[PDB]
Structure 1
Amino acid sequence: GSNEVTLLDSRSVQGELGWIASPLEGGWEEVSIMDEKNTPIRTYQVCNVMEPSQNNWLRTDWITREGAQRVYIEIKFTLRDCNSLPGVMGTCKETFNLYYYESDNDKERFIRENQFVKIDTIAADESFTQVDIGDRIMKLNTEIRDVGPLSKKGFYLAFQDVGACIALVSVRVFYKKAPLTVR
């Protein structure tokens, strides 16, 4: 810990996180690809633009909130630019939906509480970096988001894909101190 340390990374863990979500089949899939490192890492890719309406429900575990009203999280994903696709079809979504899940340690499971809530829309660009890789991910997309509704607790990421081609590159969480010491 020279300066700051990360909460948890999908690559840092490598092993399963406790996934328990996915469509019937063809949608989200677990495939290992080559990363900047020699050793391969477990990733996920979901590409299906043959019918807009699919509501791919994906859950992410291994997360925790901090004191700060909110926390810092960085998700890395790669999607196939339809603009680069010569005659893709014209039925591909160029947007994503991010949701969260919060709850108490042990009180009750109210429909209101359980009722998830979207965070914001994430899409390629914004912070796209060009890396010389031979795996596939030619256009990496990085999105910075935060979450910290329920002060009591509750930390869970949720992904939703609808007729869109996007893959997960990596994910990391980190805490930041917005309120600095001011006397």
Structure 2
Amino acid sequence: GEVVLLDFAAAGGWLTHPYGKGWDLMQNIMNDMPIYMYSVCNVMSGDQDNWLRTNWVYRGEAERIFIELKFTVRDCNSFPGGASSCKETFNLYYAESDLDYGTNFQKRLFTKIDTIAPDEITVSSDFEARHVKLNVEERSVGPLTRKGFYLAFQDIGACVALLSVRVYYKKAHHHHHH
């Protein structure tokens, strides 16, 4: 009995920082329904610190939230000269908040959950053949007590496409909802 709090791939313009750089909302329209994703791939510069933040998510009655990510990561050997500037992980954070801060973003309020690493990187020959390796990772966070929360994703120089962000809680039939 799961209750869904956020489902990016079911929805079809999240905050990004710094302005004008980094994560970008993308689509693949090779089939009748579009596939959306947040992508970043600034693998050559070596000084990247790109943040993607969900909108405010109502927590409902969840004490613990479960977070499922689906994503691709390109092999850093795809990028000639990227040995030291390219990474193959990204970082996952959260913040709790009673208030929807809107366009205001303060990194200092966020707590790291984990490094997110791919079980499978997508090598160049597979990318060009349109064969990507979709990874799935799950984490959970709590106890939570504020009205809502945010997730954020920090890129430090990897080539990542984030296709799915699902957040749910369990046993919502033991709670009274407002």
TM range, smaller chain: 0.7 to 0.9
- One of 15, 30, 34 as aligned partner of 2:25: 30
Change (3 A) 1:58 1:4: closer
Q: Once the 2 structures are TM-superposed, how far is the Cα of residue 26 of structure 1 from its aligned partner?
A: 5.1
1:142 maps onto 2:140 in alignment: no
What does the per-residue CA deviation read over 1:69-118, in whole Å, with 9 as the maximum and x for residues that have no partner? 311111111110225x3755312112211111112359xxxxxxx62211
What does the per-residue CA deviation read over 1:1-40, in whole Å, with 9 as the maximum and x for residues that have no partner? xx545333112111xxx522243445222221148x6311
Ranges in structure 1 where 5+ consecutive residues have no aligned partner: 107-113
Change (3 A) 1:134 1:11: farther
SS at match of 1:93: coil
Partner in structure 2 of residue 48 of structure 1: 42
1:7 maps onto 2:5 in alignment: yes
- Where is the helix percentage greater, Structure 1 or Structure 2? 2
The CA distance in 1 between the partners of 2:98 and 2:56, in whole Å, is 16
SS at match of 2:10: helix
1:89 maps onto 2:82 in alignment: yes
- TM-score, length of structure 2 as denominator length: 0.73
Q: Once the 2 structures are TM-superposed, how far is the Cα of residue 68 of structure 1 from its aligned partner?
A: 4.7
How many pairs does the alignment contain?
161
1:21 maps onto 2:16 in alignment: yes
Partner in structure 2 of residue 99 of structure 1: 93
1:78 maps onto 2:72 in alignment: yes
Ranges in structure 2 where 5+ consecutive residues have no aligned partner: 101-107
Residue pair 1:93, 1:164 contacting (<8 A) in 2 also:
yes
The CA distance in 2 between the partners of 1:149 and 1:10, in whole Å, is 23
Paired-residue identity, %: 57
What does the per-residue CA deviation read over 1:127-182, in whole Å, with 9 as the maximum and x for residues that have no partner? x9xxxx999461111110112344233310011001111111111111125xx9xx
Off by >4 Å, runs of 4+ in structure 1: 133-137
- Where is the strand percentage greater, Structure 1 or Structure 2? 2
RMSD (CA atoms): 3.4
Which segment is superposed worse, 45-54 or 56-65?
56-65
